[PDB]
Design a protein around this nucleic acid. Structure first.
Ligand SMILES: Nc1nc2c(ncn2[C@@H]2O[C@H](COP(=O)(O)O)[C@@H](O)[C@H]2O)c(=O)[nH]1
Ligand SMILES: Nc1ncnc2c1ncn2[C@@H]1O[C@H](COP(=O)(O)O)[C@@H](O)[C@H]1O
Ligand SMILES: Nc1ncnc2c1ncn2[C@@H]1O[C@H](COP(=O)(O)O)[C@@H](O)[C@H]1O
Ligand SMILES: Nc1ncnc2c1ncn2[C@@H]1O[C@H](COP(=O)(O)O)[C@@H](O)[C@H]1O
Ligand SMILES: O=c1ccn([C@@H]2O[C@H](COP(=O)(O)O)[C@@H](O)[C@H]2O)c(=O)[nH]1
Ligand SMILES: [Mg+2]
Ligand SMILES: [Mg+2]
Ligand SMILES: [Mg+2]
Lengths: 85, 392, 59, 217, 245
RNA sequence: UUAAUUUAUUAAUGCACCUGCAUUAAAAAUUUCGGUUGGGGCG
C-alpha cells in the first residue's frame, strides 16, 4: 500500500497505488500428511518449493516471517507433530 | 426456471477453516469460552437431538418414515375441493347418471293442497327479511352471517307441519359430524372425508324411487369421458392416509340414517365461495359419501349390486340461489366402468329471489326499488318443502 | 462530443461581426467587389491568391 | 440491507401471490431506476414458461386444455389457465385462444413438416420453413425468456444442417438449435400498440412516475 | 466408406440448394481441405442468409477460404450477425473484400467502436455503413477518424448525409483535391455556426461521385489543364506541412 | 469548459478470469483565473 507519481518524475501529481500478488491456485501433494491440498499460491512460493527441492522441506525450513501465513504455519505445527510422535 | 431467488433461499455455509484439512492436530476453537470469538477456529458442532419430548416444540418425522407411508397414492375429497369439470367430473368418479329435474314422486307430495304451510308466500318473505335486513345491529349483514340463518330458519318453517304429519317427529339435525367412504376406480383409490354442517337424520330408511327395471336400464348408458382433464384434478393427493369407512357415529346410534344434507357457501368473497357448477359437485360427493358409509356398514366391504338400495337427498344453497339433489345409491362394484350405475336427480340455478334491497334507493327523491326482496320466486320453497317431506 | 485533432481553426467559424479572425476578414471583403468588375473570373484568381506563390530569380 | 425480496416461493401454485413493489430502490436503498413507484396494487401469477414440462411418472407427448383466459396485471399480454391431467398451469395465451381450445405438446422431429393448428407447443425443428413462432428458448432446456409481450412473433426462415435461425421483432437474426420447444401462433393482445391511455393518471396507476425537469443537451 | 462419403454430402447439399454440376464444380476447390471440413464451411455461409448462387463467386475468387477451422468461424459468424450484416447484406461484403472471415477480430471491433463512439453513429447507421462500403475495414484507424471529422467540420455535412451518400468509400487522396479546390473557387463554402453565407453548397453527386474520366466534363468543366497544377500543388502542400507541422 | 496538471479509479484491448506494465475514452479530482483602460458602441 504505497504511492507513485504520474510519469516517473517527481514534479508531477502524486497518486496512490496498491500492488497485489498474482494468485495461482495449484494442486500439491504432501508426502508426510498424505493428502492433497487446494491452496492459493503465488509465483515466488512455487519458486521457493523448487529452490528448496520439496514442499514438506519448505514448511520446515522457513521461520515464521518467511511464510507468514496462518494455514502454512499450522502446516508447520501439523506436519512436525506427526514427526514428533 | 427454478422458483425462489438465491438471496431468499437458505444461506450457504461459510467455507471451512483450513485447520480441519490437517489430520495431525485437533482444532483450537471457542467451544471452551461459551460465546463467539472471531479470532478462534470455527467449531463443528455435533447434531444436537432433543433428549426429552415437548408438546409445544414437537418435531415430526419426515415423509418416508411415518407409520403409514404406503406407496399407493390415495385421493381425498373434503369440503374445500373445487372441481374443474364440475358435475361431469363428479359423475365419473361416482359412476352415477344425470337426470335433470326432481322425480315425479317427490314433486307429488307438494301437489296436495293440505301439504302447504300457512301463508307459504308470506312467511318465506318474513324469513328473508329477518336474515338479510333485521338480524344484526349492523345495517347490512354479510354472507357469513345471514346464510346460516336462512336455511335453519326455513327448516323451522318446514318443521312446523309436524302437527299435520306426526312422522316428522322422527328427525333431528346434528351439526359437525364427520363421515368418510372409500372406493376404487379402474386402479386408483378415491376417498371422501365429509366434514360439513347440518346433516338432518331420521331413523327410518328413505324409500327407493327408481325401480329395479330402471337400474337394469342403466347398463346401456356409458359414462361420458373427457380428456385432457383427468378426473382426479383438484383432489388432495395424500400418500399418508388410512383406508377407512366411517358413518360418523358408533354402533347403537338412534337416527342412524341421513335424510337431507344442508351444504352452504358461507364465504363473504366470491373468489372464496363455490360456483354453482362446483357446488353441485359437492352435493354429489357428500350424498354419495353418506350413502356409501352405510353400504360399507350394513353390507360390509364387498363389491356387489344392492338388492334393497339406499337413497339420501341433499339441499345446497348460497343464500340467494338454492340447489336440490336426491342421490340414489345402488351399486358398489365400482372398479369396472361398465354395468349398472347410480342415478341422481339434481336441480340447477333455482333461485329464491333475484335481489334484496336492504336500504332504499334514491333517484331524484322518488324511490324506484323499496325495501324487501325483489324477484321472489315462491316455487323454490315448494321444492324445499318437497325434499323435507320425502319418505314421511 | 466530437473534438478535432489538427483541423481546429476550421470549426465554429462565426458569421458577420465575427470578433476573432485576422486573415479571413480580408477574404470576406473580396467576395462582393471583385464579383462586379471580373464576372466569372473571380473563381480563377482566388485559388491562385490562397495556394502558393511562384518566385523568380533576380541574377 | 433490509430488502429481503418478495421473490421467495420455491413451490409452484396458481394462486395470486402478493407482490411487494420497490419504487426503483435496490438492496442498498439507493435509486438505480428513475420513474417508477406508487400505482395500483398488484398480485403475482407465476406463469409457467417451460411449456414442455413433463408431469410425474409419464413422459413423452401429452396434451392440454384451456379453462379461462384472464388479464394479467404484471404483464402486457393476456394469460390463460391451462390444465393437463392432475396439474394446472398459468401460461401466456395466443391470439385466437378461447376457453376450451385443443392444444398439444411434443418433442419429436419428423421427416416431414408438421402442420400447426393455432396454439400448439412444438420444437423448432418439426415446424414449417416459414411458420410464425412465439416463446423460444436459447440453449435447450431453459424455458421461455424471449418474445412474449403482445402479438410479438418471428419466423423460422431457413434451417441449415441442424440449426434454425429465428427472427426477433427487432431484425436481429439469431442461432437456435432445433430442439427448443416453442409456442406457435400469434401472441394475444394484438391491439396493445394501438392503445391510448388518455389521462396523465393512467400511467401513474400503472406504476410509472414523471420524468425530471432538467433540460438536457 | 470414401465413396459413400461424397454421397451423403451431395444428399445434404441438394436440400441446401445446389445443382449436380455446381457440387461437382466444388470438387476442384477443396485443395488441402477435407470433406467434413467442407460441409461445415458451406452450411455456415448459407445459414447466414446466403443463396447457393453467390457462394461459388467468393470461393472461386478466394480458394484459401476453406482452410479456416471450425470453432473460430462460429465466433466470427456470431459477431457479424450481431452487427446485422446477415441475410443478403453479407454478399456485398464478401465479394469486394473476400478476406473478412480470416482477418482479425479487434480491427473489426476497433473500427466499429471508432464509428459508434468517436464518430457518434447510431446502430442502424453503422450497419448501413458496413453494407454499403466494406472498404472501411482495410483502412488505417487514424485515417478513418480524420476523414469523418473533415466531413463533420470542414465539409460540415451531418450524420445521415454521410451514411446515405456512401462517403467512406473514397480516399483522402481523392477527396482533398475535390474539396479545397471547390472551396477556393467560391463554389463551395463551409457552413457557419448556424449555416453558410450566401451560396448553396453543391451535392456530393457533383463533388465526389463522378469518376476520373467523368470528372473533367461534369464537375470541373472550366479548363482541362487548370486542375493539374493544383493536383500537385496541394501534393507539395501535403508533403511540407506534414513534415514541418 | 476546447484552462493547467493527472488516470490512481471504472470501461476496453495489447505483449477465460485474476494479476503486472502500456494505449484510447468515460467519469472525475486538484488548483488558479496577472497588471493597466472596463461599461466598449467591442483595440
Ligand atoms: N451559455 C451560452 N453561451 C453562449 C451562447 N451563445 C453564445 N455564447 C457565448 O458567446 C460566445 C460567442 O458566441 P457568438 O455567437 O459568436 C460563445 O463562444 C459562448 O461563450 C448560448 O446560447 N449559451
Ligand atoms: N445565451 C447567451 N448568453 C450570452 N451571450 C449570448 C447568448 N446568446 C448570444 N450571445 C452573444 O450574442 C452574440 C451573437 O449571437 P447571435 O445568436 O448570432 C454571441 O456571439 C454572444 O456574444
Ligand atoms: N465561455 C464558456 N466557458 C465555459 N463553458 C461555456 C462557455 N460558453 C458556453 N459554455 C458551455 O456550453 C453550454 C452551451 O453554450 P453554447 O455557447 O451553446 C453552456 O451551458 C455551458 O455549459
Ligand atoms: N451610456 C449609457 N447610459 C446608460 N446605460 C448604459 C449606457 N451604455 C450602456 N448602458 C447599459 O449597459 C448595457 C450594455 O449592454 P450589453 O452589455 O451589450 C446597455 O444595454 C444599458 O443597459
Ligand atoms: O470556453 C468555452 C467556449 C465555448 N465552448 C463550446 O462552444 C460552444 C460555442 O461557444 P463559442 O462560440 O466558442 C458552446 O456552446 C460550448 O459548447 C466551450 O465548451 N467552452
Ligand atoms: Mg416527463
Ligand atoms: Mg423537460
Ligand atoms: Mg487598474
Amino acid at each position: 500500500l504505497g504511492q507513485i507519481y504520474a510519469n516517473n518524475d517527481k514534479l508531477s501529481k502524486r497518486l496512490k497505488k496498491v500492488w497485489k500478488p498474482q494468485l495461482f491456485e495449484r494442486e500439491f501433494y504432501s508426502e508426510i500428511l498424505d493428502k492433497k491440498f487446494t491452496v492459493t499460491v503465488t509465483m515466488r512460493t512455487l519458486d521457493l518449493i523448487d529452490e528448496a527441492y520439496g514442499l514438506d522441506f519448505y514448511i520446515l525450513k522457513t521461520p515464521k516471517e518467511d511464510l507468514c501465513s496462518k494455514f502454512g504455519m499450522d502446516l508447520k505445527r501439523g506436519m512436525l507433530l506427526r514427526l514428533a510422535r | 426456471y427454478e422458483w425462489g431467488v438465491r438471496s431468499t433461499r437458505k444461506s450457504e455455509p461459510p467455507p471451512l477453516d483450513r485447520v480441519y484439512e490437517i489430520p495431525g492436530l485437533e482444532p483450537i476453537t471457542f467451544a471452551g469460552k461459551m460465546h463467539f470469538v472471531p479470532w478462534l477456529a470455527r467449531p463443528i458442532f455435533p447434531p444436537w437431538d432433543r433428549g426429552y419430548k415437548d408438546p409445544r416444540f414437537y418435531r415430526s418425522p419426515p415423509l418416508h418414515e411415518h407409520p403409514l407411508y404406503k406407496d399407493q397414492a390415495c385421493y381425498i375429497f373434503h369440503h374445500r375441493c373445487r372441481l374443474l369439470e364440475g358435475v361431469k367430473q363428479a359423475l365419473w368418479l361416482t359412476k352415477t347418471k344425470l337426470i335433470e329435474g326432481l322425480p315425479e314422486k317427490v314433486l307429488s307430495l307438494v301437489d296436495d293442497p293440505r301439504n302447504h304451510i300457512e301463508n307459504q308466500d308470506e312467511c318465506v318473505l318474513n324469513v328473508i327479511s329477518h336474515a338479510r335486513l333485521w338480524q344484526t345491529t349492523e345495517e347490512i349483514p354479510k354472507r357469513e352471517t345471514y346464510c346460516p340463518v336462512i336455511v335453519d330458519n326455513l327448516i323451522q318453517l318446514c318443521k312446523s307441519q309436524i302437527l299435520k304429519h306426526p312422522s316428522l317427529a322422527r328427525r333431528i339435525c346434528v351439526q359437525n359430524s364427520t363421515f368418510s367412504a372409500t372406493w376404487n376406480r379402474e386402479s386408483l383409490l378415491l376417498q371422501v372425508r365429509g366434514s360439513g354442517g347440518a346433516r338432518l337424520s331420521t331413523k327410518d330408511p328413505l324409500p327407493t324411487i327408481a325401480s329395479r327395471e330402471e337400474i337394469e336400464a342403466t347398463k346401456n348408458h356409458v359414462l361420458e369421458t373427457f380428456y385432457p382433464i383427468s378426473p382426479i384434478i383438484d383432489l388432495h393427493e395424500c400418500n399418508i392416509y388410512d383406508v377407512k369407512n366411517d358413518t360418523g357415529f358408533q354402533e347403537g346410534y338412534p337416527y342412524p340414517y341421513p335424510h337431507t344434507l344442508y351444504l352452504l357457501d358461507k364465504a363473504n368473497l366470491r373468489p372464496h365461495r363455490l360456483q354453482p357448477d362446483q357446488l353441485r359437485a359437492k352435493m354429489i360427493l357428500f350424498a354419495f359419501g353418506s350413502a356409501l358409509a352405510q353400504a360399507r356398514l350394513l353390507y360390509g366391504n364387498d363389491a356387489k349390486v344392492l338388492e334393497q338400495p339406499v337413497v339420501v337427498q341433499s339441499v345446497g344453497t348460497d343464500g340467494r340461489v338454492f340447489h336440490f339433489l336426491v342421490f340414489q345409491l345402488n351399486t358398489t362394484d365400482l372398479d369396472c366402468n361398465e354395468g349398472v350405475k347410480n342415478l341422481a336427480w339434481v336441480d340447477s340455478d333455482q333461485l329464491l329471489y333475484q335481489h334484496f334491497w336492504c336500504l332504499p334507493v334514491i333517484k331524484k327523491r322518488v324511490v324506484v326499488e323499496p325495501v324487501g326482496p325483489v324477484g321472489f320466486k315462491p316455487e323454490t320453497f315448494r321444492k324445499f318443502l318437497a325434499l323435507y317431506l320425502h319418505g314421511a | 462530443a466530437t473534438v478535432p485533432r489538427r483541423h481546429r481553426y476550421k470549426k465554429k467559424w462565426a458569421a458577420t461581426e465575427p470578433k476573432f479572425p485576422a486573415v479571413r476578414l480580408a477574404l470576406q471583403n473580396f467576395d462582393m467587389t471583385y464579383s462586379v468588375q471580373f464576372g466569372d473570373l473571380w473563381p480563377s484568381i482566388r485559388v491562385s491568391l490562397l495556394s502558393e506563390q511562384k518566385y523568380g530569380a533576380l541574377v | 440491507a433490509n430488502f429481503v425480496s418478495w421473490k421467495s416461493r420455491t413451490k409452484y401454485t396458481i394462486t395470486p401471490v402478493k407482490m411487494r413493489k420497490s419504487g426503483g430502490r435496490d438492496h442498498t436503498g439507493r435509486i438505480r431506476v428513475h420513474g417508477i413507484g406508487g400505482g395500483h396494487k398488484q398480485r403475482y401469477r407465476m406463469i409457467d414458461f417451460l411449456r414442455f414440462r413433463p408431469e410425474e411418472t409419464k413422459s413423452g407427448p401429452f396434451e392440454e386444455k384451456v379453462i379461462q383466459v384472464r388479464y394479467d396485471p404484471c404483464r402486457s399480454a393476456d394469460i390463460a389457465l391451462v390444465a393437463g391431467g392432475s396439474r394446472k398451469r398459468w401460461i401466456i395465451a395466443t391470439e385466437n385462444m378461447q376457453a376450451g381450445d385443443t392444444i398439444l405438446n411434443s418433442n419429436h422431429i419428423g421427416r416431414m413438416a408438421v402442420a400447426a393448428r393455432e396454439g400448439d407447443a412444438h420444437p423448432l425443428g418439426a415446424l414449417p420453413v416459414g411458420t410464425l413462432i412465439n416463446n423460444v428458448e436459447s440453449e435447450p432446456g431453459r424455458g421461455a425468456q424471449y418474445i412474449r409481450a403482445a402479438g410479438t412473433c418471428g419466423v423460422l426462415l431457413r434451417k441449415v444442417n441442424g440449426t434454425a435461425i429465428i427472427q426477433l421483432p427487432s431484425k436481429r437474426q439469431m442461432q437456435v438449435l432445433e430442439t427448443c420447444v416453442a409456442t406457435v401462433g400469434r401472441v394475444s393482445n394484438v391491439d396493445h400498440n394501438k392503445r391510448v391511455i388518455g389521462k396523465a393518471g393512467r400511467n401513474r396507476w400503472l406504476g410509472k412516475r414523471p420524468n425530471s425537469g432538467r433540460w438536457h443537451r | 466408406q470414401g465413396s459413400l462419403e461424397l454421397e451423403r454430402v451431395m444428399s445434404s447439399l441438394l436440400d441446401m440448394g445446389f445443382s449436380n454440376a455446381h457440387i461437382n464444380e466444388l470438387l476442384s476447390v477443396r485443395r488441402g481441405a477435407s470433406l467434413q471440413q467442407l460441409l461445415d464451411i458451406i452450411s455456415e455461409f448459407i445459414l447466414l442468409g446466403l443463396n447457393p448462387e453467390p457462394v461459388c463467386v467468393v470461393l472461386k475468387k478466394s480458394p484459401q477460404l476453406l482452410k479456416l477451422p471450425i470453432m473460430q468461424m462460429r465466433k466470427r459468424s456470431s459477431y457479424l450477425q450481431k452487427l446485422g450484416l446477415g441475410e443478403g447484406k453479407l454478399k456485398r461484403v464478401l465479394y469486394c473484400c473476400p478476406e473478412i472471415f480470416t482477418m482479425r477480430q479487434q480491427d473489426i471491433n476497433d473500427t466499429v467502436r471508432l464509428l459508434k463512439e468517436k464518430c457518434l453513429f447510431t446502430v442502424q447507421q453503422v450497419t448501413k455503413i458496413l453494407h454499403s462500403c466494406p472498404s472501411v475495414l482495410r483502412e488505417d484507424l487514424g485515417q478513418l477518424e480524420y476523414k469523418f471529422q473533415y466531413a463533420y467540420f470542414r465539409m460540415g455535412i451531418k450524420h445521415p448525409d454521410i451514411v446515405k451518400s456512401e462517403y467512406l468509400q473514397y480516399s483522402l487522396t481523392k477527396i482533398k483535391q475535390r474539396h479545397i479546390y471547390l472551396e477556393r473557387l467560391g463554389r463551395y463554402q463551409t457552413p457557419d455556426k448556424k449555416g453558410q453565407t450566401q451560396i448553396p453548397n453543391p451535392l456530393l453527386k457533383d463533388i465526389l461521385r463522378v469518376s476520373e474520366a467523368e470528372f473533367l466534363a461534369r464537375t470541373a468543366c472550366t479548363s482541362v489543364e487548370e486542375f493539374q497544377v493544383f493536383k500537385k500543388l496541394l501534393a507539395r502542400e501535403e508533403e511540407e506541412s506534414e513534415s514541418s507541422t
